[PDB]
């Protein structure tokens with residue numbers, strides 16, 4: 398079975414809309430989402446569909462760009478670090494679960510190289 402997806406809505410969690418979070422949506426997420434290699438990362442890993450009952454035994458902090466997109470569009474975050482951590486969790490989960498050189502790892506590595514380039518240019522808070 399698949400676990401429930403990560404939280405994307407919680408009225409108890411305090412929220413902000415900042416210029417760094419806007420950059421994460423309008424520059425970072427947009428660039429990565431349109432990459433040719435983005436598609437396996439655009440929704441939670443579907444262990445049922447892939448017949449991978451082991452995935453959620455190994456990966457206990459799942460994350461994906463569909464969840465991140467919802468968090469950004471629905472103003473779930475307080476700060477940019479929360480969102481950057483989600484991206485980093487997504488990449489590291491892929492490297493933990495899969496073998497070096499696997500197609501999915503090469504795809505994640507291409508997205509991560511672009512992510513790092515965009516994050517290096519993160520604007521100062523206004």
Ligand SMILES: CCOC(=O)Nc1cc(-c2ccc(C)c(NS(C)(=O)=O)c2)nn2c(C)nnc12
Nearest residue numbers: 437438439440441442443444447491494495501
């Ligand atoms: C032991 C074999 O290892 C794997 O198959 N690994 C991985 C596979 C895929 C993957 C493939 C095909 C499809 C159709 C999907 N779609 S989805 C997002 O709905 O689940 C995902 N994503 N993936 C991610 C992220 N991280 N690892 C993997």
